[PDB]
Amino acid sequence: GGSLYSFGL
């Protein structure tokens, strides 16, 4: 996913 950046917390 990576909503925030890459991790997608």
N, CA, C and O atoms as a Tripos MOL2 file, in Angstrom:
@<TRIPOS>MOLECULE
protein
   36    35     9     0     0
PROTEIN
NO_CHARGES

@<TRIPOS>ATOM
      1 N           0.8230   -1.1980    0.0000 N.3       1 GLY1
      2 CA          0.0000    0.0000    0.0000 C.3       1 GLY1
      3 C           0.8670    1.2620    0.0000 C.2       1 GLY1
      4 O           1.1440    1.8490   -1.0460 O.2       1 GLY1
      5 N           1.2810    1.6550    1.1960 N.am      2 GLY2
      6 CA          2.1110    2.8370    1.3470 C.3       2 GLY2
      7 C           1.2780    4.1140    1.2190 C.2       2 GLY2
      8 O           1.5700    4.9910    0.4050 O.2       2 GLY2
      9 N           0.2410    4.1910    2.0410 N.am      3 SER3
     10 CA         -0.6390    5.3460    2.0290 C.3       3 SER3
     11 C           0.1350    6.5960    2.4550 C.2       3 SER3
     12 O           0.0530    7.6480    1.8190 O.2       3 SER3
     13 N           0.8800    6.4510    3.5390 N.am      4 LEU4
     14 CA          1.6690    7.5560    4.0570 C.3       4 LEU4
     15 C           2.8280    7.8430    3.1010 C.2       4 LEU4
     16 O           2.9960    8.9630    2.6170 O.2       4 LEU4
     17 N           3.6140    6.8080    2.8460 N.am      5 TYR5
     18 CA          4.7550    6.9350    1.9550 C.3       5 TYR5
     19 C           5.0030    5.6310    1.1940 C.2       5 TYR5
     20 O           4.8660    5.5660   -0.0280 O.2       5 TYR5
     21 N           5.3700    4.6040    1.9460 N.am      6 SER6
     22 CA          5.6400    3.3040    1.3600 C.3       6 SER6
     23 C           5.1000    2.1960    2.2680 C.2       6 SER6
     24 O           4.5830    1.1810    1.8030 O.2       6 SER6
     25 N           5.2370    2.4220    3.5660 N.am      7 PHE7
     26 CA          4.7720    1.4560    4.5480 C.3       7 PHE7
     27 C           3.2420    1.4050    4.5800 C.2       7 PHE7
     28 O           2.6380    0.3320    4.5810 O.2       7 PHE7
     29 N           2.6420    2.5850    4.6070 N.am      8 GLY8
     30 CA          1.1930    2.6880    4.6400 C.3       8 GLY8
     31 C           0.6460    2.2790    6.0100 C.2       8 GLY8
     32 O          -0.1600    1.3560    6.1290 O.2       8 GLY8
     33 N           1.1060    2.9890    7.0310 N.am      9 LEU9
     34 CA          0.6720    2.7130    8.3890 C.3       9 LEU9
     35 C          -0.8060    3.0810    8.5340 C.2       9 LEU9
     36 O          -1.3780    2.9250    9.6120 O.2       9 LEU9
@<TRIPOS>BOND
     1     1     2 1
     2     2     3 1
     3     3     4 2
     4     3     5 am
     5     5     6 1
     6     6     7 1
     7     7     8 2
     8     7     9 am
     9     9    10 1
    10    10    11 1
    11    11    12 2
    12    11    13 am
    13    13    14 1
    14    14    15 1
    15    15    16 2
    16    15    17 am
    17    17    18 1
    18    18    19 1
    19    19    20 2
    20    19    21 am
    21    21    22 1
    22    22    23 1
    23    23    24 2
    24    23    25 am
    25    25    26 1
    26    26    27 1
    27    27    28 2
    28    27    29 am
    29    29    30 1
    30    30    31 1
    31    31    32 2
    32    31    33 am
    33    33    34 1
    34    34    35 1
    35    35    36 2
@<TRIPOS>SUBSTRUCTURE
     1 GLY1         2 RESIDUE 1 A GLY
     2 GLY2         6 RESIDUE 1 A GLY
     3 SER3        10 RESIDUE 1 A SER
     4 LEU4        14 RESIDUE 1 A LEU
     5 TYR5        18 RESIDUE 1 A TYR
     6 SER6        22 RESIDUE 1 A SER
     7 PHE7        26 RESIDUE 1 A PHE
     8 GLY8        30 RESIDUE 1 A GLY
     9 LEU9        34 RESIDUE 1 A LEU
